[PDB]
Amino acid sequence: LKVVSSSIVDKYIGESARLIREMFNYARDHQPCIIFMDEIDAIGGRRFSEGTSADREIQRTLMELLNQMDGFDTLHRVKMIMATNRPDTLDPALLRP
């Protein structure tokens, strides 16, 4: 499953995490299938970092993703690999083992 995130962020910044949870459930359906966060930064126009017009909704989604990855949504030995060089900034807390 390719997490480009263009489909995941549609009309609601908040819904992006919820849509990712739906994708995670779809990933849970196939144990061999592995989530791939390819082009995670890629989005309509350009990724929105903290700003007056648009804040870092993607960074909030990344923190939400960390919560989804461990505890609430981990089953079927499915790996949500963030195998992407697309994001400009990598969260230090994410880097933690």
């Binding site: 609601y12 910044i13 908040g14 007056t52 648009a54 804040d55 909030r60 923190m63 939400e64």
Partner: protein, 209 residues
């Protein structure tokens, strides 16, 4: 006929059926912080009678401030797991829509849910609820963020006294740490989380191992 009431806080009350699942026993070593947060949040709902007997009006808001990784949120989720109240943690940004001063939408949901079951408890984190696309001060820009602080302060004032909407805040930010937020009647109790020292570390290490 009248249909049964519709809609629920976030996905549903108490963070839906999604309990955090971290027990207080699992959070080992934050003994002083655990006791203080429990008195401010869990005890008023469980034993309002004790507070009425001394006529103290239960302390409501709690501020938890510490160097990152010190155990405040594991405790915050733990309070949600051990709570019998509708503790919709309601981190500031989640199901919230684009809005200006969205502090009212979150609090209004809490009052209804607290009335439906037991006084609800709110944890303030993911504080990016605002900074929405439909947002921007006329020229100051910073003023719009200040407008959010004022809107939250108005809601916090006194909320449903006995069905108190307890608010737990763990933001290490001085900009939203105005004296007014720190004033008693807003964040009544302040707990500072120290970096685990010897003995506290021994407890964290023993529990994890």
């Amino acid at each position: 006929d009248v249909l049964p009431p519709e809609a629920d806080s976030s996905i549903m009350m108490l963070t839906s059926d999604q309990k955090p699942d971290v027990m207080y026993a699992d959070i080992g070593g934050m003994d002083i912080q655990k006791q203080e947060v429990r008195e401010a949040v869990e005890l008023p709902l469980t034993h309002f009678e004790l507070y009425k007997q001394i006529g103290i009006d239960p302390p409501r808001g709690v501020l938890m401030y510490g160097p990152p990784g010190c155990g405040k949120t594991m405790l915050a989720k733990a309070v949600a797991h051990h709570t019998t109240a509708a503790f919709i943690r309601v981190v500031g940004s989640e199901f919230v829509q684009k809005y200006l001063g969205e502090g009212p939408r979150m609090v209004r949901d809490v009052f209804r849910l607290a009335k439906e079951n037991a006084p609800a408890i709110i944890f303030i984190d993911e504080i990016d609820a605002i900074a929405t696309k439909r947002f921007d001060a006329q020229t100051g820009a910073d003023r719009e963020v200040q407008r959010i602080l004022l809107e939250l302060l108005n809601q916090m004032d006194g909320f449903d006294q006995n069905v108190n909407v307890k608010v737990i805040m763990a933001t290490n930010r001085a900009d939203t740490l105005d004296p007014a937020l720190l004033r008693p009647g807003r964040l009544d109790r302040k707990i500072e989380f120290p970096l685990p020292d010897r003995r506290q570390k021994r407890l964290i290490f023993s529990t994890i191992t």
